[PDB]
């Protein structure tokens, strides 16, 4: 069901990746035949191995196949972090990044050297660093040291910020997200 939907995104996005210069998997996905993510991963791993043997372990094709398997495993990792984020990241309706998740992502000002503080969602964390996804164009990811993090509740004018155009859009997207959160406006 939802699994079939997520696997369709992965297969599609990996075919787009495959243009780095399998129907069986495509069929098994399209027909919703997979009953596990590890099962899907094993098939991708099998496909990788048959490919590396088919062309040679140092062929251009083997270089691409390893990259494709890596990216696929990355997709499955991301899917586990938050399946709502994963869905919205693929479907991408208008203001897709503004819709809240359950549980809600912690919102922080994240500082990278040279960029000043930028608003972001927390995807996961450990004691010394936080994996964040920034608001604004491109919606990129970065591991941020714990000491470069401030909770979203502090006023922005008290933080080192560089007010580029992209920064303003990011803050506008942040405010729209906070509104959707208060509204209880979930994506349907």
């Amino acid at each position: 069901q939802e699994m079939g939907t997520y696997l369709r995104f992965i297969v599609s996005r990996m075919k787009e990746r495959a243009i780095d210069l399998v129907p069986t998997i495509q069929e098994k996905v399209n027909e919703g035949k997979y009953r596990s993510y590890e099962e899907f991963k094993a098939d991708a791993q099998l496909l990788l191995h048959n490919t590396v043997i088919f062309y040679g372990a140092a062929s251009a094709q083997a270089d691409i196949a390893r990259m494709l398997y890596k990216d696929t495993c990355h997709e499955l990792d991301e899917l586990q972090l938050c399946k709502n984020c994963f869905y919205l990241s693929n479907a991408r309706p208008d203001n897709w990044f503004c819709y809240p998740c359950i549980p809600n992502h912690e919102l922080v000002w994240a500082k990278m050297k040279g960029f000043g503080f930028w608003p972001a969602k927390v995807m996961q964390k450990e004691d010394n660093q936080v994996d964040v996804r920034f608001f604004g164009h491109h919606h990129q990811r970065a591991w941020i040291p714990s000491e470069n993090i401030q909770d979203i509740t502090v006023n922005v004018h008290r933080l080192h910020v560089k007010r580029s155009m992209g920064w303003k859009k990011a803050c506008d997207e942040l405010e729209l997200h906070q509104r959707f959160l208060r509204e209880g406006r979930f994506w349907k």
Binding site: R13, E78, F86, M112, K113, G114, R141, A142
Partner: peptide
């Protein structure tokens, strides 16, 4: 770039 976001390059 992955749909869930690529790594933001250091300044």
């Amino acid at each position: 770039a992955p749909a869930t976001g690529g790594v933001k390059k250091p300044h």
